[PDB]
Design an enzyme around this catalytic site. Structure first.
Site, mmCIF file in Angstrom:
data_model
loop_
_atom_site.group_PDB
_atom_site.id
_atom_site.type_symbol
_atom_site.label_atom_id
_atom_site.label_comp_id
_atom_site.label_asym_id
_atom_site.label_seq_id
_atom_site.Cartn_x
_atom_site.Cartn_y
_atom_site.Cartn_z
ATOM 1 N N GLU B 62 -23.517 14.659 29.999
ATOM 2 C CA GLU B 62 -24.143 13.348 29.863
ATOM 3 C C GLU B 62 -24.428 13.086 28.390
ATOM 4 O O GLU B 62 -25.134 13.879 27.754
ATOM 5 C CB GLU B 62 -25.414 13.302 30.705
ATOM 6 C CG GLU B 62 -26.049 11.928 30.867
ATOM 7 C CD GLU B 62 -26.946 11.531 29.717
ATOM 8 O OE1 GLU B 62 -27.527 12.423 29.068
ATOM 9 O OE2 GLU B 62 -27.078 10.316 29.484
ATOM 10 N N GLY B 135 -27.633 20.161 37.883
ATOM 11 C CA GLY B 135 -26.227 20.328 38.189
ATOM 12 C C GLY B 135 -25.421 20.905 37.046
ATOM 13 O O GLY B 135 -24.907 22.023 37.143
ATOM 14 N N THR B 136 -25.302 20.141 35.956
ATOM 15 C CA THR B 136 -24.468 20.579 34.845
ATOM 16 C C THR B 136 -24.987 21.866 34.220
ATOM 17 O O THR B 136 -24.194 22.768 33.944
ATOM 18 C CB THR B 136 -24.350 19.475 33.787
ATOM 19 O OG1 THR B 136 -23.564 19.951 32.688
ATOM 20 C CG2 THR B 136 -25.710 19.037 33.278
ATOM 21 N N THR B 170 -39.566 18.466 39.908
ATOM 22 C CA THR B 170 -39.115 17.146 39.484
ATOM 23 C C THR B 170 -38.019 16.594 40.383
ATOM 24 O O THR B 170 -37.995 15.388 40.641
ATOM 25 C CB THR B 170 -38.630 17.203 38.033
ATOM 26 O OG1 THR B 170 -39.679 17.712 37.200
ATOM 27 C CG2 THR B 170 -38.237 15.822 37.542
ATOM 28 N N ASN B 197 -42.264 26.116 34.227
ATOM 29 C CA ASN B 197 -43.040 25.216 33.378
ATOM 30 C C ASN B 197 -44.533 25.272 33.685
ATOM 31 O O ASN B 197 -45.361 25.021 32.801
ATOM 32 C CB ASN B 197 -42.527 23.786 33.531
ATOM 33 C CG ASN B 197 -41.125 23.607 32.994
ATOM 34 O OD1 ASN B 197 -40.650 24.401 32.183
ATOM 35 N ND2 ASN B 197 -40.450 22.555 33.442
ATOM 36 N N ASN B 219 -41.426 23.679 24.464
ATOM 37 C CA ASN B 219 -40.251 24.186 23.772
ATOM 38 C C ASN B 219 -40.617 24.887 22.474
ATOM 39 O O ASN B 219 -39.930 25.827 22.066
ATOM 40 C CB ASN B 219 -39.276 23.042 23.516
ATOM 41 C CG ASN B 219 -38.858 22.340 24.786
ATOM 42 O OD1 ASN B 219 -38.491 22.976 25.773
ATOM 43 N ND2 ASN B 219 -38.922 21.016 24.775
ATOM 44 N N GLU B 245 -30.341 47.877 22.207
ATOM 45 C CA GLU B 245 -31.331 48.849 22.661
ATOM 46 C C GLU B 245 -32.298 48.252 23.665
ATOM 47 O O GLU B 245 -33.515 48.424 23.545
ATOM 48 C CB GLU B 245 -32.084 49.423 21.466
ATOM 49 C CG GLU B 245 -31.226 50.223 20.500
ATOM 50 C CD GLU B 245 -32.005 50.710 19.294
ATOM 51 O OE1 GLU B 245 -31.383 51.246 18.353
ATOM 52 O OE2 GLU B 245 -33.245 50.557 19.287
HETATM 53 N N1 GTP Z 1 -39.086 23.725 29.918
HETATM 54 C C1 GTP Z 1 -38.379 22.605 29.999
HETATM 55 N N2 GTP Z 1 -37.734 22.279 31.174
HETATM 56 C C2 GTP Z 1 -37.014 21.135 31.266
HETATM 57 C C3 GTP Z 1 -36.917 20.283 30.183
HETATM 58 N N3 GTP Z 1 -36.152 19.235 30.540
HETATM 59 C C4 GTP Z 1 -35.756 19.407 31.824
HETATM 60 N N4 GTP Z 1 -36.291 20.576 32.292
HETATM 61 C C5 GTP Z 1 -36.103 21.149 33.636
HETATM 62 O O1 GTP Z 1 -34.764 20.973 34.050
HETATM 63 C C6 GTP Z 1 -34.702 20.688 35.434
HETATM 64 C C7 GTP Z 1 -33.521 19.780 35.752
HETATM 65 O O2 GTP Z 1 -32.425 20.070 34.917
HETATM 66 P P1 GTP Z 1 -32.206 19.234 33.562
HETATM 67 O O3 GTP Z 1 -32.123 20.161 32.375
HETATM 68 O O4 GTP Z 1 -33.329 18.244 33.383
HETATM 69 O O5 GTP Z 1 -30.823 18.444 33.766
HETATM 70 P P2 GTP Z 1 -29.422 19.210 33.588
HETATM 71 O O6 GTP Z 1 -29.641 20.701 33.483
HETATM 72 O O7 GTP Z 1 -28.726 18.682 32.364
HETATM 73 O O8 GTP Z 1 -28.574 18.856 34.908
HETATM 74 P P3 GTP Z 1 -28.138 17.340 35.227
HETATM 75 O O9 GTP Z 1 -29.221 16.692 36.047
HETATM 76 O O10 GTP Z 1 -26.852 17.352 36.010
HETATM 77 O O11 GTP Z 1 -27.947 16.564 33.945
HETATM 78 C C8 GTP Z 1 -36.024 20.036 35.778
HETATM 79 O O12 GTP Z 1 -36.503 20.528 37.007
HETATM 80 C C9 GTP Z 1 -36.968 20.423 34.658
HETATM 81 O O13 GTP Z 1 -37.969 21.284 35.147
HETATM 82 C C10 GTP Z 1 -37.564 20.603 28.996
HETATM 83 O O14 GTP Z 1 -37.488 19.853 28.030
HETATM 84 N N5 GTP Z 1 -38.297 21.765 28.908
HETATM 85 N N1 GDP Z 2 -42.617 59.666 10.285
HETATM 86 C C1 GDP Z 2 -41.939 58.533 10.585
HETATM 87 N N2 GDP Z 2 -41.502 58.351 11.857
HETATM 88 C C2 GDP Z 2 -40.820 57.235 12.206
HETATM 89 C C3 GDP Z 2 -40.561 56.220 11.180
HETATM 90 N N3 GDP Z 2 -39.877 55.229 11.778
HETATM 91 C C4 GDP Z 2 -39.712 55.582 13.076
HETATM 92 N N4 GDP Z 2 -40.276 56.774 13.334
HETATM 93 C C5 GDP Z 2 -40.277 57.461 14.648
HETATM 94 O O1 GDP Z 2 -38.959 57.445 15.196
HETATM 95 C C6 GDP Z 2 -38.990 57.108 16.586
HETATM 96 C C7 GDP Z 2 -37.851 56.145 16.881
HETATM 97 O O2 GDP Z 2 -36.629 56.706 16.411
HETATM 98 P P1 GDP Z 2 -35.351 55.773 16.131
HETATM 99 O O3 GDP Z 2 -35.637 54.818 15.001
HETATM 100 O O4 GDP Z 2 -34.954 55.015 17.376
HETATM 101 O O5 GDP Z 2 -34.201 56.820 15.713
HETATM 102 P P2 GDP Z 2 -32.659 56.349 15.663
HETATM 103 O O6 GDP Z 2 -32.195 56.003 17.056
HETATM 104 O O7 GDP Z 2 -31.814 57.475 15.121
HETATM 105 O O8 GDP Z 2 -32.529 55.140 14.771
HETATM 106 C C8 GDP Z 2 -40.346 56.482 16.862
HETATM 107 O O9 GDP Z 2 -40.955 57.115 17.993
HETATM 108 C C9 GDP Z 2 -41.179 56.720 15.620
HETATM 109 O O10 GDP Z 2 -42.318 57.521 15.942
HETATM 110 C C10 GDP Z 2 -41.068 56.490 9.815
HETATM 111 O O11 GDP Z 2 -40.888 55.673 8.886
HETATM 112 N N5 GDP Z 2 -41.727 57.632 9.607
HETATM 113 MG MG MG Z 3 -28.776 15.638 32.423
#
Ligand code: GTP
Ligand code: GDP
Ligand code: MG
Ligand code: GTP
Ligand code: GDP
Ligand code: MG
EC number: 3.6.5.-
Lengths: 430, 430, 430, 430
Positions: B62, B135-136, B170, B197, B219, B245
């Site tokens: 649309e 829909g879309t 809605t 929402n 938003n 991760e």
């Molecule tokens: N959080 C959030 N939800 C929205 C917003 N606008 C629409 N919605 C949700 O979207 C649902 C309907 O889908 P829409 O995104 O409005 O329309 P569409 O996904 O483009 O699908 P069409 O009706 O075919 O155009 C509604 O039930 C709303 O709850 C928004 O700005 N913020």
């Molecule tokens: N002493 C120390 N420990 C660290 C530091 N940064 C991360 N760690 C430890 O390392 C762990 C995570 O390891 P990770 O970063 O995932 O190792 P990698 O997977 O090899 O990159 C955490 O539980 C921290 O306690 C640091 O700057 N100093």
């Molecule tokens: Mg629409």
């Protein structure tokens, strides 16, 4: 001579190295531009241990940095002392592992490791007399705990007679940052026992406890934990870079602290540690150092050392001091605590003295003790592993990349066997 | 060298895409014209000299919303021929946008996706936004996901779907296409986040103190959540998390990947600065059932895994000290087979404020993505609404006459029954 | 004394020479105006090798430039160092060959070659003691591969005792820019084996591979390939222009690298080559040079040298270094790779040392090895030739200018015989 | 010293000549008056002081178009007496313009051709433009080609003929004279390029997004193709191609020289800059069957040889990396007896934009000239159209009464049957 190369992997290992190399450079007076500006002659005599020489008189660390994602190495380069690292040693992939051990050990880590092994081989073949390797990595991550441990086996297969060090951070259940920590911890411990000559466990929980209770600083950060780990790391090899009354290389510690080849998991601690406001109150004496050295809260692990008995212990004193006092204090700390020392091996404490203290301190001590109390960490890790595995939770991620549940069962069984046979000697009597 | 592509389809999708794209441009300093007066690379691409082009594509059948976009202040930003527009709306009919008019448009969208993907070198994954009750939106989202799952394969796709509220609605026919779209994305999307929402209306009313909110206020909060999720890819942090991760930490089983989000703090500048906004209080507010971003009660079910992101000046020790407090509480209970369930990420960049908006500027924030067993209630109530009208075959002729078969409604019902049985089977203790 | 003249033909040869002469002039400190501005005395002692002397003290290269179209020489004159070339040596036609070998060898190339042979005879008769000629041309073009090879025979007929060099670029099937490449490649290889004393094959595909993998630069251009080829070209004759421990002219290499008169097709490589970011990491040592020198990816040809056995090898070290280390490393590279060296000729590696390194580098190595692995290039060229010839495709263009299919059959048979008898010695055993 | 002469005959020929001559004057900076306010020499000639005169001649029997030319803004450019004009039109009758009124005009055209040729010294060849479906165009083109083939002999002539569309047609009798003119130029022209209007209409509609195109939009695209083809003669490039280097690369056999062209990119300024226009995507778009400049499907036949020109900042390695991808695809298959089929040219000058036109300014472009076996379909359908009316001898009296014999229609039919048999015979594998 008898130098070692540095290899680090993962984000945690890279952050540890980023402070370890800063500490080493500050100790040897090397500016962040690679130019020596030191004061003492001894600062240059044994610089070949960690630093290489290039044209123009500047020095470059023999470190190898590897990760499956480029962000961490792109960030460490902009930090202080980041220019020392040779750009050629940076190896990285474009995908990452996502904390999945299988991806970092079978599918992605297998193809990339050839390039890093090439530079590792280049570094080791060249050096005068190899002493060994030291490895820093974390067991809580996928890419680290996978690629590092596979690299351990690959290095061991090619250099069976050299020594191998690993500083391993294991995931504690108190401060948990990843839900899949037990899987890749249990898988990694299986491979780590078979190949590493020495292993040193470090826990973030113990580091936070130390920072909050002994230093009493309000807001700990990763920089403080890294600094403590770096000081502990530097303390081990100090006498190999400086003269002393009783020099003791890494191999000598390996001989004296490992009774049986499968019992090589140590917990460490550094002394002295004092708050800023109380640094003037205290007086640095050998009794003051040794009372803090054996303190339970001073250990870098949450494991409680009075819940078990020490198989052996080691201490690396720094500074100029009398040997008679050191020996008598070591004897006294062993007579007053006979209940916590195993009885079928007498005189189970090793001591060493180095005449060069750390910059800014007059005396320092590094403690490395092999104790039976470490069983509690593997017990809780296996407990969480078996609580999560019985429902096959998160198992499909691992099984979708060629791995199966049989390797999980074997890993669990081997880890439980290690736990059992480590405590077998605790109840042993003569 | 890390990239991500965001897909916006439908009126709600485009209206939330506008909301996120003011925020990203503001956060990276890019003016609405696209000109700056190395972190941009995740969402943008450099043209060689001057302007930046978003890695986003807008879809709708649309033309009104796209025409509004192409005449606003952001007319110069987006590439003119990535705002794909149709002529005839699907008019809330799912069968139209999946079988009749969406097929002739989907080829152009896939060509645009290929042209954007060939530019990226480190593609992390895709993001998609679509309001489900249309829909879309639902139909084209289903078709695009089905095409992408086979064109690219293992690349990760994330879906920020907006399900209808429990009682507030809605349309009158939205349960039918909601159920069909859930069928379609159940086996095709890696992550789905709940966004109804009514919960966000209650959040605005209670915290922001706005008694007459419009869609823009909703938003903007969604855009802030997206920015908090993707901050770790483009800013330096002490504990990084990547998109890949996630399935290793939040998704215990391939079928279960629907989770609900929350954000904290949410507060206006008129009373924000009177209180300190400590990390403990914000992490307590994030776990409050009334602050869920989807209208579901977490007290009615167990937790499976919690992934929660921080940003600002937060220190890890304070995070651990707050995770312990939450584990202490008796009103929040985790599933038996999960001892630790928290994955923690810490980033340094504080959240950015949009001028004229609702939220104020703060130094600390927390965003949680939590997978819980209580989500089955929304499926049960949607199923009950569907059954009431499907008993008499109401409104079915609007779908059978658009090419869809009669039996297609039943199998979606069977898949929902299977999902509800699976959620019950997982939540029982061993 | 013992100087050589330069003759180049075709567009590719002219572009190679346009960088070769720039490199030589920069090495000898000659400004683009022909005025010496060097620093060292040795820069002028042996300048008669490549440069002539004229009134006013300026120097002029003894190069002869020929092509069948005027565009390339009208373009090279406007480039840097383009004024050095004497305008009298420029000879060109008004028609061109259109990549047709027959036109550039029978109809058009025959009438024009008298003028270029006149200036060639003028240059050779005058010089103090002739060493020989070096030829740069491409086998993928018509005018080059025709006129150059006919000129080879004409020169050989008049100077049977002098030495002749040819640097020949053969068309690879990977990067193909002309559809009629196999025809004029096969026709040229037939004549080239009968007259050239030395031949050195160079492939654009290998140059792109080297630039992408070793230097790791993003956007290769013809300027980089030309620079690499120019450095390799200069490395061969370095010791003939500078003093050294073991001088070795071109004739000495001819004696030691060609076992039988028909086996004179070498592939070369240059070391060291490092990226800009890793030029500070590496340390230049003899082991580092020799490990990169024998690397398979470092060869200037796509031929894989571990698919065959070396008949002989040569290395031309540059810079001041100890000879004992060079000899022991050459022995070590031959003991650890005994499977890839033919066994009935012991000690099949030649070494030479020159004390003058390249400008900007402290050590450099040029590698010239005669290996049996070169058969693969002729195999694929003949395969494409026989795939295209069996249908008589594009044959009328050649047959309309006095050529027949009998000369194609003889060329194919002789090329296949060369392929067979080159591998005959690979399976030979003692 | 390189020249080319373009011949324009008929209304379509003159209207495309105008289109190419705005573009050339704009590209070389020459104002419409002919005055500049060394690359021009290919298309122009210097008069000694001031203006430049095109090397072109305009022919037509019907005076309206020439009179329009002689009063527009370009009245001062062309020489007054090279715009040869007749009095009576041929009125779509081929026999008229070949036997009745064209003979009295052809002598003046040949005199003008001689007067233009005596000025050139390096004449590369001739270009000719003529819409085939007209009396004067086809007849005079045939007569001029037949006279030139004997006056000059081996000089190359290129024909940019515009064949009628498959179903869209403006006349009712155009198959007759199309077949006769194909007969005439089959044995008399070296290259013929297909240019039917329907394919270019579809190109404009799909890419340029013009829903109401006129002939000028078509002629501008044709002019751009001509400029891309002839750019290599008047601009510096890394890989040059001459006109005479075509029959050696695109024409396997003397009979087969009809090929179809394509161009990329074609895009408007409103959405051009939103995408990066990499070389890979443009070379993919050029090979798309829907972007053929003639309405023929390449998927229905094999390829024989592809000659494709680039211009801009393209790097050869990126070209090779894209040729490999095309060789990879399974939907594009080459003939068995052609292993490599690509000839690549690279030029530095980007395409020039005409103000008020359709195309935007871009830095990269690709033009392909491809010879394929699928071209036989247009011959088959033209033959089928011819047979329907020749069965009843319709419209023949309009040709017999203009001096042509009855049997002249049959032999053109026999030659088309021979050509169709030859195309089938070539495309079968060995
Ligand atoms: N959080 C959030 N939800 C929205 C917003 N606008 C629409 N919605 C949700 O979207 C649902 C309907 O889908 P829409 O995104 O409005 O329309 P569409 O996904 O483009 O699908 P069409 O009706 O075919 O155009 C509604 O039930 C709303 O709850 C928004 O700005 N913020
Ligand atoms: N002493 C120390 N420990 C660290 C530091 N940064 C991360 N760690 C430890 O390392 C762990 C995570 O390891 P990770 O970063 O995932 O190792 P990698 O997977 O090899 O990159 C955490 O539980 C921290 O306690 C640091 O700057 N100093
Ligand atoms: Mg629409
Ligand atoms: N592409 C293109 N084709 C044209 C153009 N003008 C005419 N034609 C084609 O030319 C065909 C007829 O020939 P014309 O060029 O119009 O007339 P002619 O060649 O001068 O022959 P006469 O009718 O005798 O004057 C028609 O079928 C058109 O398709 C043009 O401007 N562009
Ligand atoms: N190294 C290098 N190779 C080139 C260059 N220009 C062209 N070539 C190669 O030369 C081949 C074409 O040769 P060509 O120009 O037709 O030779 P000619 O017929 O003697 O003019 C192509 O395959 C290119 O790979 C250049 O500047 N440098
Ligand atoms: Mg007309």
């Amino acid at each position: 001579m008898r130098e070692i190369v540095h290899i680090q992997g993962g984000q945690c290992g890279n952050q540890i190295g980023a402070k370890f190399w800063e500490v080493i450079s500050d100790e040897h007076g090397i500016d962040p531009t690679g130019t020596y500006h030191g004061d003492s002659d001894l600062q240059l005599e044994r610089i070949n241990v960690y630093y290489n020489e290039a044209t123009g008189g500047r020095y470059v660390p023999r470190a190898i940095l590897m990760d499956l994602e480029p962000g961490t190495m792109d960030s460490v380069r902009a930090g202080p002392f980041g220019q020392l690292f040779r750009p050629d040693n940076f190896v990285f992939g474009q995908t990452g592992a996502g904390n999945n051990w299988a991806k970092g050990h079978y599918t992605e880590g297998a193809e990339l490791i050839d390039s890093v092994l090439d530079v590792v081989r280049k570094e080791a073949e060249g050096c005068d007399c190899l002493q060994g390797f030291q490895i820093t990595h974390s067991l809580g991550g996928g890419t680290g705990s996978g690629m590092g441990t596979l690299l351990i086996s690959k290095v061991r297969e090619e250099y069976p007679d050299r020594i191998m060090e690993t500083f391993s951070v294991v995931p504690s259940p108190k401060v948990s940052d990843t839900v899949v920590e037990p899987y890749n911890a249990t898988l990694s411990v299986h491979q780590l026992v078979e190949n590493a000559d020495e292993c040193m466990v470090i826990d973030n929980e113990a580091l936070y406890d130390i920072c909050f209770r002994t230093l009493k600083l309000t807001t700990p950060t990763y920089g403080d934990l890294n600094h403590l780990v770096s000081a502990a790391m530097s303390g081990v090899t100090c006498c190999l870079r400086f003269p002393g009354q009783l020099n003791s290389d890494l191999r000598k510690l390996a001989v004296n602290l490992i009774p049986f080849p499968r019992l090589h998991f140590f917990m460490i601690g550094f002394a002295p540690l004092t708050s800023r406001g109380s640094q003037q109150y205290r007086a640095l004496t050998v009794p003051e150092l040794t009372q803090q050295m054996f303190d339970a809260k001073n250990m870098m692990c949450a494991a409680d050392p009075r819940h078990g008995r020490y198989l052996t212990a080691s201490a690396l004193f720094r500074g100029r001091m009398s040997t008679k006092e050191v020996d008598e204090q070591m004897l006294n700390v062993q007579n007053k605590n006979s209940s916590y020392f195993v009885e079928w091996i007498p005189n189970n404490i090793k001591s060493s003295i180095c005449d060069i203290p750390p910059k800014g301190l007059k005396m320092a001590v590094t403690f490395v003790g092999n104790s039976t109390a470490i069983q509690e960490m593997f017990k809780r890790v296996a407990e969480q592993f078996t609580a999560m595995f019985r429902r096959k939770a998160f198992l499909h991620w691992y099984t979708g990349e060629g791995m199966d549940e049989m390797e999980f069962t074997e890993a669990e069984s081997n880890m439980n066997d290690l736990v059992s046979e480590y405590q077998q000697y605790q109840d042993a009597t003569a | 060298m890390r990239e991500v592509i965001s897909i916006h389809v439908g009126q709600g999708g485009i209206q939330v895409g506008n909301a996120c794209w003011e925020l990203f441009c503001l956060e990276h300093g890019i003016q609405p014209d696209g000109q700056m007066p190395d972190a941009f690379n995740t969402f943008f691409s450099e043209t060689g000299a001057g302007k930046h082009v978003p890695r986003a594509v807008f879809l709708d059948l649309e033309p009104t919303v796209i025409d509004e976009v192409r005449t606003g202040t952001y007319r110069q930003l987006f590439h003119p021929e990535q705002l794909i527009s149709g002529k005839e709306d699907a008019a809330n009919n799912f069968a139209r946008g999946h079988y009749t008019i969406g097929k002739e448009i989907v080829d152009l969208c896939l060509d645009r996706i290929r042209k954007l993907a060939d530019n990226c070198t480190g593609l992390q994954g895709f993001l998609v936004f679509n309001s489900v009750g249309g829909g879309t939106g639902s139909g084209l989202g289903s078709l695009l996901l089905e095409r992408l799952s086979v064109d690219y394969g293992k690349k990760s796709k994330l879906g920020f779907t907006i399900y209808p509220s429990p009682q507030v609605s809605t349309a009158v026919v939205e349960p039918y296409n909601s159920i069909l779209s859930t069928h379609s994305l159940l086996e095709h999307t890696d992550v789905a986040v709940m966004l109804d929402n009514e919960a966000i209306y209650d959040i605005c009313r209670r915290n922001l103190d706005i008694e007459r909110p419009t869609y823009t206020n909703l938003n903007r909060l969604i855009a802030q959540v997206i920015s908090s999720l993707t901050a770790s890819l483009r800013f330096d942090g002490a504990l990084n998390v990547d998109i890949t991760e996630f399935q290793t930490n939040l998704v215990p089983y391939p079928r279960i990947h629907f989770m609900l989000s929350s954000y904290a703090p949410i507060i206006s500048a008129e009373k924000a600065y009177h209180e300190q906004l400590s990390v403990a209080e914000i992490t307590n507010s994030a776990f409050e059932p009334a602050n869920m971003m989807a209208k579901c009660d977490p007290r009615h079910g167990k937790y499976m895994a919690c992934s929660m992101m921080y940003r600002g000046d937060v220190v890890p020790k304070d995070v651990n000290a707050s995770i312990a407090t939450i584990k202490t509480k008796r009103t929040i209970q985790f599933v038996d087979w999960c001892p630790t369930g928290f994955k923690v990420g810490i980033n340094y960049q504080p959240p950015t404020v949009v001028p004229g908006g609702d939220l104020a500027k703060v130094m600390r924030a927390v965003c949680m993505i939590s997978n819980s067993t209580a989500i089955a209630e929304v499926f049960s109530r949607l199923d009950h609404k569907f059954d009431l009208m499907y008993a008499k075959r109401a409104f079915v002729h609007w779908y059978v006459g658009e090419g869809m078969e009669e039996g297609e409604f039943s199998e979606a019902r069977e898949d929902l029954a299977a999902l509800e049985k699976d959620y019950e089977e997982v939540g029982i203790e061993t």
